[PDB]
């Protein structure tokens, strides 16, 4: 605890001084024990509001494992089935292949990102998704979830369901599926199925408390830049084209619930979901819990580069060596474009969480590599 | 912030190490800027649940300034009046002097604790209050507020109203008064008059969320001991006889709302109340706010020993030298038998709060001195 904290703070002091990071919250738990839980830097640089351990964050893709858990909870009760056609819940979500034909898309294809769906960010401006007006869920658009899905459904699949892997809007699709199966709006379903059962009281999709949030910043010279609605931020090499951010999205009741990018939460709440995933204290049947954490795509998917497969909740480490990491085989990992990164090294009983207000340093920048290496020292 | 945090943390580490404290949440603000907001130790030692910044605490007498503010808000609106007799609202509340007569008891008399009323703790078992079965509001009893007050009023006053000072059930009496003036139960009234306007969202009288609380322990060697309903714990020298604790009281819907001892709240909520008192940004009319923070009793009252008077919300430091404290004249201070202590050193713009689960170390043990001295270090 003291030796680990020494290394992590050294990384944090350097990134803060180097104006590469505005503020963050990082927690390291081992077998349920908190070894590190510290707020760093600032939440709102202009107001001079220091970051706090329970400051709220726009989760972006950190929303995925939480929403994925809700899907699995419904599967466990038989309200959903891994092999069931998505059309049972979304009668009109019938995307076609490039040749015009209509394939079967199961709950399984969606949770694994093997359905053939994609994201606007994969190609950006001028692409098919850009022409059809498909949103990735991080911006604020004047239309609902059903509209976005209709636009999405009209884009051709990149490949046949199950024949490949591609990061996509599948979790946003599953969000609509959850609403149908549950009869409740997504926030209420997630609360009932995951949040409440796990004691996550500080999360949701729409907040009325801006004073509690970490104001989003993006990488910049000679210091990160405070985000505003509409800012398109180019993604790093091999990460896609760009992301259009809408920091006010979280306070707008009219922003449709994004199952792949629209929740907010505190670091303690996210940790709760990750610990549930890690230790499965009777939260899900064991076989389903094992399948969800196992690689369901193949190392060939290279989800975070070589050595990484993908399950029902995130990337799964199949090959530490090919991935160039000290993490053990079976490690679960993913992040969020707002500047977040997390991983559960199952063998070590470790849950490592990094939530930040600096996109993309806190997601893929050197910061993430230095913190990971410091935890392994 | 950094140096203060280091000093405060050293004090806390030593207390935890020596097993004089199970867990606590302390906040230090100066002129509205949070300098220290830190959770320490465990909320539930036996379950290994750590203390969190938002952990809920049974406030004991930290309830008084909050209820006092409610009373004061009604005064500001002309619903209550400082010199109005308590009988205008509680016709039957007619306590008598040892002489047999019914002296006037005003709102001012009650707020200041100069009405002549007392507490069972003043003398404990055998006493007059014991004979009449009067409750101090920390224990769980099978009768309502009106019955406790009917028992209270049947006791003779210790002195003529305004003739002296003595800690009492006056805020409990005021609690009833507030219910009459507003036509609402105490919890709703407080929420309407204080909690809602100050953004206090995690306070109240009855809670149904036990998992959010700090579990009550009492001082002990080797370590503090977890309390159960009905146990009696002797107060330290000069603080009265003892207190009968009922940790389940906060969860019982039939527990009468105690104006002097019955609320729960997070540390943030309490800071919101202390700050409103300290800075009064349009919460109460200036003259009333000044009166409330001004000594209305005299140094002679020695409310917290020599050098201390009392206003309408807490003790008011009149003589730092006599009180043997580094705190500046004009300082407001009070505590709670569950193990709490707070103070507002007005001259320095300081609001210092300590909420703990260890009775009475957190209220009056060395911990309180060591933290006070570290602040002014």
- In this complex, the residue of B54, B211, B212 whose CB is nearest that of residue A54 is B54
Residues A52, B54: C-beta atoms closer than 8 Å = no
What is the rounded CA–CA span in Å between residue B358 and residue B217? Answer: 5
Nearest-Cα distance to chain B for A54, in Å, is 8
DSSP per-residue codes, B183-231: TS-HHHHHIIIIITTTT--S-BS--S-GGGBPPPEE--SSS-EE--TT-
The SS3 of residue B256 is coil
What is the rounded CA–CA span in Å between residue B132 and residue B127? Answer: 9
Nearest-Cα distance to chain B for A317, in Å, is 31
Nearest-Cα distance to chain A for B4, in Å, is 15
Relative orientation angle of helices B286-293 and B63-76, to the nearest 10 degrees: 150
**Which residues on adjacent β-strands are paired with residue A226?**
A217
Which residues from chain A sit within 8 angstroms of residue B52, using beta carbons? 54, 268
Chain A nearest-CA residue for B210: A199
Residue B295 to residues A207, A257, B64, B171, B330: CA-CA distances in angstroms?
43, 55, 16, 18, 8
Which residues from chain A sit within 8 angstroms of residue B43, using beta carbons? none
Of A126, A147, A143, A137, the closest CA to residue A168 belongs to A137
Catalytic residue (one of B3, B61, B127, B168): B61
What is the rounded CA–CA span in Å between residue B175 and residue B178? Answer: 5
Helix (DSSP H) and strand (DSSP E) numbers for chain A: 11, 15
Nearest-Cα distance to chain A for B34, in Å, is 9
Residues B34, A54: C-beta atoms closer than 8 Å = no
Contact yes or no for A233/A121 (Cβ under 8 A): no
- In this complex, the residue of B34, B53, B211 whose CB is nearest that of residue A53 is B53
Mutate to test the interface with B, among A29, A33, A49, A53 (most CBs of B within 10 A): A53
- Dihedral sign, Cα of residue B132, residue B134, residue B140, residue B144: positive
Which residues from chain A sit within 8 angstroms of residue B212, using beta carbons? 201
Can the peptide bond before residue A360 be classed as cis, meaning omega within 30 degrees of 0?
yes
Residues A53, B54: C-beta atoms closer than 8 Å = no
Residues A53, B50: C-beta atoms closer than 8 Å = no
Chain A nearest-CA residue for B55: A54
Mutate to test the interface with A, among B6, B51, B53 (most CBs of A within 10 A): B53
- In this complex, the residue of B34, B50, B54 whose CB is nearest that of residue A34 is B50
Chain A nearest-CA residue for B36: A52
DSSP state of A120: G
Nearest 10 degrees: Cα torsion B218, B219, B225, B229: -20
What is the rounded CA–CA span in Å between residue A173 and residue B70? Answer: 49
Give backbone dihedrals phi and psi of B5, rounded to 5 degrees, phi first. -60, -40
The angle formed by the CA atoms of residues A142, A143 and A146, to the nearest 5 degrees, is 165
What is the rounded CA–CA span in Å between residue B235 and residue B242? Answer: 5
Chain B nearest-CA residue for A38: B38
Residue B208 burial class via C-beta count within 10 angstroms: exposed 0-12, middle 13-18, buried 19 and up: exposed
Count CB atoms within 10 A of the CB of residue A368.
Answer: 22
Q: Where are the beta strands (DSSP E) in A84-124?
A: none
- Beta strands across the sheet bearing A23-30: A49-50, A33-44, A23-30, A350-356, A340-345, A332-336, A315-317, A308-310
What is the rounded CA–CA span in Å between residue B364 and residue A115? Answer: 64
Half-sphere exposure of A66 (CA within 13 A, CB side): 38
Residues 6+ apart with CB under 8 A from B269: B195, B200, B201, B202, B203
DSSP per-residue codes, A318-335: S-HHHHT-SSPTT-EEEE
Residues B52, A50: C-beta atoms closer than 8 Å = no
CATH 3.40.710.10 fits B1-377, yes or no: yes
Nearest-Cα distance to chain A for B38, in Å, is 9
Residues B53, A54: C-beta atoms closer than 8 Å = yes
Catalytic (active-site) positions of A: 61
What is the rounded CA–CA span in Å between residue B45 and residue B14? Answer: 17
Nearest-Cα distance to chain B for A56, in Å, is 13
Contact yes or no for B354/B8 (Cβ under 8 A): no
Per-domain boundaries in chain B: 1-377
Chain A nearest-CA residue for B49: A33
Report the first-to-last Cα separation within chain B, whole angstroms: 13
Which residues from chain A sit within 8 angstroms of residue B39, using beta carbons? 53
Length of chain B, in residues: 377
What is the rounded CA–CA span in Å between residue A234 and residue B11? Answer: 48
CB pairs under 8 A between A and B: 13
Residues 6+ apart with CB under 8 A from A48: A42
Mutate to test the interface with A, among B4, B23, B52, B201 (most CBs of A within 10 A): B52
Nearest-Cα distance to chain B for A256, in Å, is 27
Chain A nearest-CA residue for B32: A49
**Experimentally, how was this structure solved?**
X-ray
Which residues from chain A sit within 8 angstroms of residue B50, using beta carbons? 34
- In this complex, the residue of A52, A199, A268 whose CB is nearest that of residue B37 is A52
What is the rounded CA–CA span in Å between residue A38 and residue A213? Answer: 16
- The bridge status of strand A358-359 relative to strand A217-218 is parallel
Contact yes or no for B279/B198 (Cβ under 8 A): no
Which residues from chain B sit within 8 angstroms of residue A268, using beta carbons? 52
What is the rounded CA–CA span in Å between residue A258 and residue B97? Answer: 69
What is the rounded CA–CA span in Å between residue B176 and residue A204? Answer: 38
DSSP per-residue codes, B271-330: HHHHHHHHH-SSSS-HHHHHHHHS-SS-GGG-BTBTTEEE-SSSEEES-HHHHT-SSPTT
Residues 6+ apart with CB under 8 A from B362: B21, B24, B338, B339, B340, B341, B354, B355, B356, B368
Residue A322 burial class via C-beta count within 10 angstroms: exposed 0-12, middle 13-18, buried 19 and up: middle
The SS3 of residue A117 is coil
Helix (DSSP H) and strand (DSSP E) numbers for chain B: 12, 15
DSSP state of A301: G
Resolution (A): 2.0
Residues B52, A268: C-beta atoms closer than 8 Å = yes
Chain A residues bordering chain B (beta-carbon distance below 8 Å): 34, 50, 52-54, 199, 201, 268
Residues A52, B50: C-beta atoms closer than 8 Å = no
Of A200, A171, A169, the closest CA to residue A56 belongs to A200
**Which residues on adjacent β-strands are paired with residue A317?**
A308
Chain B residues bordering chain A (beta-carbon distance below 8 Å): 1, 34, 37, 39, 50, 52-54, 211-212
What is the rounded CA–CA span in Å between residue A158 and residue A161? Answer: 9
SS3 labels along A165-230: CCCCCHHHHHHHHHHHHHCCCHHHHHHHHHHCCCCCCCCECCCCCHHHECCCEECCCCCCEECCCC
Breaks (C-N over 2.5 A) in chain A follow: none
Which residues from chain B sit within 8 angstroms of residue A201, using beta carbons? 212
Of B88, B195, B91, the closest CA to residue B150 belongs to B91
Chain B nearest-CA residue for A268: B52
Contact yes or no for A61/A262 (Cβ under 8 A): no
Of B60, B180, B169, the closest CA to residue B111 belongs to B169
What is the rounded CA–CA span in Å between residue B250 and residue B58? Answer: 7
Can the peptide bond before residue A319 be classed as cis, meaning omega within 30 degrees of 0?
no
Residues B53, A52: C-beta atoms closer than 8 Å = yes
């Amino acid at each position: 605890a003291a030796s680990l904290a020494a290394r992590l703070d050294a990384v944090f002091d350097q990134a803060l001084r180097e104006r590469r990071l505005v503020g963050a919250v990082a927690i390291v738990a081992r077998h349920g024990e908190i070894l590190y839980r510290r707020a760093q830097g600032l939440a709102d640089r202009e107001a001079g509001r220091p970051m706090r351990e329970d400051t709220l964050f726009r989760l972006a893709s950190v929303t995925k494992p939480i929403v994925a858990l809700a899907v699995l909870r419904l599967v466990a009760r038989g309200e959903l089935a891994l092999d069931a056609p998505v059309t049972r819940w979304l009668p009109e979500f019938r995307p076609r292949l490039a040749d015009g034909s209509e394939p079967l898309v199961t709950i399984h294809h969606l949770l694994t990102h093997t359905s053939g769906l994609g994201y606007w960010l994969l190609e950006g401006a001028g692409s098919v998704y850009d022409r059809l007006g498909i949103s990735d869920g991080i911006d604020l658009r004047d239309f609902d979830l059903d509209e976005n899905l209709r636009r999405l459904a009209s884009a051709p699949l990149s490949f046949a369901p199950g024949s490949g892997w591609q990061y996509s809007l599948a979790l946003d699709v599953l969000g609509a599926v959850v609403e149908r199966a549950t009869g409740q709006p997504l926030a209420a379903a997630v609360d009932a199925l995951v949040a409440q059962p796990l004691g996550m009281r500080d999360c949701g999709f729409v907040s009325a408390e801006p004073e509690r949030f970490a104001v989003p910043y993006h990488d910049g010279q000679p210091e990160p830049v405070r985000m505003r609605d509409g800012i398109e931020v180019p993604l790093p090499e091999g990460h896609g084209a760009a992301v259009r951010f809408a920091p006010s999205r979280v306070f707008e009741p009219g922003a449709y619930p994004s199952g792949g990018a629209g929740m907010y939460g505190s670091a303690d709440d996210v940790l709760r979901a990750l610990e549930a995933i890690r230790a499965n204290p009777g939260f899900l049947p064991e076989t389903l819990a094992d399948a969800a954490r196992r690689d369901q795509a193949g190392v060939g998917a290279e989800t975070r580069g070589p050595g990484w497969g993908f399950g029902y909740l995130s990337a799964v480490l199949d090959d530490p060596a090919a991935a160039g990491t000290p993490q053990h085989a079976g490690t679960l990992q993913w992040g969020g474009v707002y500047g977040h990164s997390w991983f559960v090294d199952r063998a070590l009983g470790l849950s490592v969480l990094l939530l930040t207000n600096t996109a993309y340093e806190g997601m893929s920048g050197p910061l993430t590599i230095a913190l990971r290496d410091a935890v392994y020292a």
